[PDB]
Design a protein around this motif. Structure first.
Motif, PDB file in Angstrom:
ATOM      1  N   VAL A 118       0.892  -1.149   0.000  1.00 45.21           N
ATOM      2  CA  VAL A 118       0.000   0.000   0.000  1.00 45.21           C
ATOM      3  C   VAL A 118       0.938   1.208   0.000  1.00 45.21           C
ATOM      4  N   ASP A 119       1.809   1.271   1.014  1.00 47.05           N
ATOM      5  CA  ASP A 119       2.995   2.117   0.889  1.00 47.05           C
ATOM      6  C   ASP A 119       3.769   1.700  -0.363  1.00 47.05           C
ATOM      7  N   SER A 120       4.006   2.623  -1.282  1.00 43.58           N
ATOM      8  CA  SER A 120       4.505   2.271  -2.616  1.00 43.58           C
ATOM      9  C   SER A 120       5.921   1.716  -2.602  1.00 43.58           C
ATOM     10  N   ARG A 121       6.653   1.854  -1.498  1.00 43.55           N
ATOM     11  CA  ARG A 121       8.063   1.394  -1.565  1.00 43.55           C
ATOM     12  C   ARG A 121       8.172  -0.125  -1.641  1.00 43.55           C
TER      13      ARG A 121
ATOM     14  N   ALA B  58       6.569   8.771   0.387  1.00 48.08           N
ATOM     15  CA  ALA B  58       6.196   7.854  -0.676  1.00 48.08           C
ATOM     16  C   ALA B  58       4.763   8.053  -1.115  1.00 48.08           C
ATOM     17  N   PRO B  59       4.542   7.993  -2.424  1.00 40.79           N
ATOM     18  CA  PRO B  59       3.154   7.968  -2.891  1.00 40.79           C
ATOM     19  C   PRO B  59       2.427   6.767  -2.309  1.00 40.79           C
ATOM     20  N   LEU B  60       1.178   7.038  -2.000  1.00 43.30           N
ATOM     21  CA  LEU B  60       0.255   5.974  -1.621  1.00 43.30           C
ATOM     22  C   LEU B  60      -0.190   5.214  -2.850  1.00 43.30           C
TER      23      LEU B  60
ATOM     24  N   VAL C 165      -2.144   1.607   6.745  1.00 42.48           N
ATOM     25  CA  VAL C 165      -0.702   1.627   6.970  1.00 42.48           C
ATOM     26  C   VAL C 165      -0.310   1.823   8.434  1.00 42.48           C
TER      27      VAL C 165
ATOM     28  N   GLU D   9       4.082   7.587   8.309  1.00 41.91           N
ATOM     29  CA  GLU D   9       4.499   6.260   7.879  1.00 41.91           C
ATOM     30  C   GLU D   9       5.144   6.270   6.495  1.00 41.91           C
ATOM     31  N   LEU D  10       4.558   7.026   5.580  1.00 37.87           N
ATOM     32  CA  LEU D  10       4.966   6.991   4.179  1.00 37.87           C
ATOM     33  C   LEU D  10       6.319   7.623   3.903  1.00 37.87           C
ATOM     34  N   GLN D  11       6.790   8.522   4.777  1.00 35.95           N
ATOM     35  CA  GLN D  11       8.070   9.156   4.577  1.00 35.95           C
ATOM     36  C   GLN D  11       8.246   9.680   3.157  1.00 35.95           C
TER      37      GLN D  11
ATOM     38  N   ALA E 287       3.702  -3.092  10.699  1.00 36.45           N
ATOM     39  CA  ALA E 287       2.691  -2.211  11.297  1.00 36.45           C
ATOM     40  C   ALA E 287       1.498  -1.997  10.383  1.00 36.45           C
ATOM     41  N   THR E 288       1.422  -2.654   9.243  1.00 32.26           N
ATOM     42  CA  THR E 288       0.404  -2.367   8.206  1.00 32.26           C
ATOM     43  C   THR E 288      -0.475  -3.595   7.944  1.00 32.26           C
ATOM     44  N   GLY E 289      -1.521  -3.427   7.125  1.00 29.66           N
ATOM     45  CA  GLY E 289      -2.326  -4.567   6.737  1.00 29.66           C
ATOM     46  C   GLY E 289      -1.571  -5.551   5.872  1.00 29.66           C
TER      47      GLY E 289
END
Ligand SMILES: [O-][O-]
Ligand SMILES: [Cu+2]
Ligand SMILES: [Cu+2]
Ligand SMILES: [Cu+2]
Ligand SMILES: [Cu+2]
Lengths: 276, 73
Positions: free
Chosen positions: A132-135, B68-70, B45, B64-66, A201-203
């Protein structure tokens, strides 16, 4: 068929566990476990249907999910079983669990990226695909978002709770299951996910192989609770909307009930489990 | 009644929330959020860490994303 404390694995057992996990990832099977878990995370709600989390079936659902995963591992290497992480004892980043020969350590400060171990992005062997987080790299921040894992005294307080679960059978409940899950009280299972940080920490928390070791110890705590409370069993036992009763089947398998999963010894034993 | 809507720039990113039961967006990308029985919120997230409001869940997601695109869910 024996699930062992991670801290006790031999070098060869660590090597074979890692290789089996990496082959499940390479073949595309691993990611579908991540995807299944995220679907249930996003669909399990306190006022509607709820099966994998925030409900009495949290424990048998993860027991069967972990059995699915362990059986997949054993299709690669029949000697491998899931180890468990007792986070009440192995509570710092210097636990051997987090060594480069096992799961690798915490993430670097800039971007949370794990830099060592078999699951570091640099190895090319652990792409994060279901996300979900794109990394696309494994991340952790051990002890970053909460500063302590549960202690044994906290765990003991939860184990002493006699009722398995109570109406309304959700994140608001009193009782053992919701205190182990962690939505009420001193917080065991949810806090460990928060402590690891990164994908845990995520789904999409099964993206981190520590997910399985965390849930194998949650699963062991259920077995310890049963030994402490032989007079207590899974509830509810019939006719409850939106919640899996004792003799009802569970998604996604549809063919297994909580009743079929209460006795772990049908499937595995532990290296050590206190008797009542 | 659902929480009020919100719209702000938090750590450089636009976060919006609105009743639908409730939707949150980070830079125009929808973020899965959920309400707990006790009134707290989580997002996909930060899904094991209840916070008191949907704006707090959106903020926790930006943290959380630091940068980063969702990705859409
Ligand atoms: O719950 O992972
Ligand atoms: Cu789960
Ligand atoms: Cu959700
Ligand atoms: Cu978990
Ligand atoms: Cu007795």
């Amino acid at each position: 068929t024996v699930r062992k404390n991670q801290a006790t694995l031999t070098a060869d057992e660590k090597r074979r566990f890692v290789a089996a996990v990496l082959e499940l990832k390479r073949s595309g099977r691993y990611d579908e476990f991540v995807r299944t878990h995220n679907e249930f995370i996003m669909s399990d709600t306190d006022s509607g249907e709820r099966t994998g989390h925030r409900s009495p079936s949290f424990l048998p659902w993860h027991r069967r999910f972990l059995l699915d995963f362990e059986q997949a591992l054993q299709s690669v290497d029949s000697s491998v079983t899931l180890p468990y992480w007792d986070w009440s004892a192995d509570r710092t980043v210097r636990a051997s669990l987090w060594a480069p020969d096992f799961l690798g350590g915490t993430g670097r400060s800039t971007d949370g990226r794990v830099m060592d171990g078999p699951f570091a992005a640099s190895t090319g062997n652990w792409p994060i695909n279901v996300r979900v987080d794109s990394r696309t790299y494994l991340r952790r921040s051990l002890g970053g978002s909460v500063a302590e894992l549960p202690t044994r005294a906290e765990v003991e307080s939860v184990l002493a709770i006699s009722a398995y679960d109570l109406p309304p059978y959700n994140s608001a409940s009193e009782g053992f299951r919701n205190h182990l899950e962690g939505w009420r009280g001193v917080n065991l299972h949810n806090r460990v996910h928060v402590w690891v940080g990164g994908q845990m920490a995520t789904g999409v928390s099964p993206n981190d192989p520590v997910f399985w070791l965390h849930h194998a110890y949650v699963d062991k705590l259920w077995a310890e609770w049963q030994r402490r409370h032989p007079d207590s069993a899974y509830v509810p036992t019939g006719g409850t909307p939106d919640v899996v009763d004792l003799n009802e089947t569970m998604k996604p398998w549809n063919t297994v009930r909580p009743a079929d999963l209460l006795d772990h010894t049908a499937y595995y034993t532990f290296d050590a489990l206190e008797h009542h | 009644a659902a929480p009020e809507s919100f719209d702000e720039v938090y750590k450089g990113r636009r976060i919006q929330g609105r009743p639908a039961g409730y939707e949150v967006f980070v830079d125009g990308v929808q973020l899965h959020v959920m309400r707990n029985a006790d009134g707290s919120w989580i997002s996909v997230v930060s899904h094991y860490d209840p916070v008191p409001t949907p704006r707090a869940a959106a903020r926790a997601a930006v943290d959380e994303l630091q940068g980063a695109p969702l990705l859409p869910f």
